[PDB]
Amino acid sequence: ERPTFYRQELNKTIWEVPERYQNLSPVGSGAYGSVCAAFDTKTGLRVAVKKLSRPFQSIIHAKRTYRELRLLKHMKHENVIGLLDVFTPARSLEEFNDVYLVTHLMGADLNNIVKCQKLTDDHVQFLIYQILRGLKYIHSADIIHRDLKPSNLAVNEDCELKILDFVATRWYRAPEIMLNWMHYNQTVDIWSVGCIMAELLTGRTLFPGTDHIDQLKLILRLVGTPGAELLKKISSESARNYIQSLTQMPKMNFANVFIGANPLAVDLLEKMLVLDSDKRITAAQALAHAYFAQYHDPDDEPVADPYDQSFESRDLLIDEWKSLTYDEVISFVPPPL
Ligand SMILES: CN(C)c1cnc(-c2cccc3ccccc23)c(-c2ccncc2)n1
Ligand SMILES: Fc1ccc(-c2n[nH]cc2-c2ccncc2)cc1
Ligand SMILES: Fc1ccc(-c2n[nH]cc2-c2ccncc2)cc1
């Protein structure tokens, strides 16, 4: 321990952090960890501190901890959560048991901003622009988010947005994921963005499926049952039988479904909510869409440094994942103040 730590209990959870962080107050808890807001005396910044839950209890948890830390250390973009700091009270690998992550405090999530109401067109343009700008970066690193939804989008009072954590998740999931296709691609994230954008425009969940089958049904109601070109790509005999046995439905007219919305917004929705993932617009392409003319800047939509996910295929011992994680804690270099 280079800095001096202090201990305290907050909601049954023990928090041991450096004295630079003051006035911890809980903001939320999950199965993966708990978060407190705090004041960083060194920078004058309000920060969020996340304490991971049982990070090395099993090989599974240990690998997930490593995965999360590696990802977070790599994400350096204005629209993606990143790290201000990472620390452990442990003085050596032997006593290493806890991991704390620090980032700039964000005020609320998009679900809170939606208030289940319609946002203005300018707000929809700026919020979706930011999601896509972050998604361009994430995708450029060969990372798929896979779980985009309003609760995973942090937003400040000035409408600044950051993507987090690479109500029901299924509502924003791509149809090919409902079908359990093993080879989905990055455009599953674009599907999610389309579902989010629709909700910001209408104030209603686009596809509020009660289960996976219902979710697919609702999707096909809007975009229609698969055409011949898409059917040819389905390997599963059972899946084809199921799909081809549904009463066929044509694609709805998006202009009528979203009547009143900016025609440019409607056009983009049409390009995002395409049933065949191979024909969906990419994040980079979407940024160039006329809907974002007021915000698009091709010279300020950066890509990420390459990201090595080779560790994902490795089968290591629990202490090996723990040691790799410890190395990542020790090697952390904070971003310039
Ligand atoms: C599920 N949600 C909404 C989460 C999850 N984790 C963190 C989080 C909280 C604290 C530190 C973090 C470090 C890296 C990545 C995420 C975090 C936050 C958070 C981040 C910034 N401000 C407020 C809250 N929200
Ligand atoms: F949403 C989904 C997800 C998967 C299936 C499925 N895949 N293979 C076979 C089927 C299926 C599901 C239900 N009834 C018959 C067949 C059908 C709908
Ligand atoms: F009903 C549907 C809904 C979506 C899909 C889908 N869209 N993009 C890719 C596919 C797909 C699904 C299953 N197997 C291969 C590809 C295919 C059938």
The biggest beta sheet is recorded as: 5 strands, antiparallel
Outline type: globular
Under CATH, the homologous superfamily of the largest domain reads: Transferase(Phosphotransferase) domain 1
- Radius of gyration over alpha carbons? 22 Å
Quickly list its features:
binds ligand A1BLA, Transferase(Phosphotransferase), domain 1, globular, alpha+beta, 337 residues, three-stranded antiparallel sheet, Phosphorylase Kinase, domain 1, five-stranded antiparallel sheet, 12 helices
Overview of the structural elements:
The structure is a monomer. This protein is of the alpha+beta class and 337 residues long. It folds into 2 domains: 5-105 and 308-330, 2-Layer Sandwich (Phosphorylase Kinase, domain 1); 108-292, Transferase(Phosphotransferase) domain 1 (Transferase(Phosphotransferase), domain 1), CATH 1.10.510. The chain is 35% helix and 16% strand. The protein has 12 helices and 10 strands. It has a 5-stranded antiparallel sheet, with no helix packed on it. Helix 1 (59-74) runs parallel beside helix 12 (318-330) and helix 3 (121-140) runs antiparallel to helix 5. The longest helix is centred in the middle third of the chain and has 20 residues, at 121-140. It is globular, with a radius of gyration of 22 Å. One 4-[3-(4-fluorophenyl)-1H-pyrazol-4-yl]pyridine is lined by residues 175-176, 179, 181, 226, 230, 233-234, 243, 275-277. The ligand CN(C)c1cnc(-c2cccc3ccccc23)c(-c2ccncc2)n1 is lined by residues 27, 35, 48-50, 72, 81, 83, 101-103, 105-106, 109, 154, 164-165.
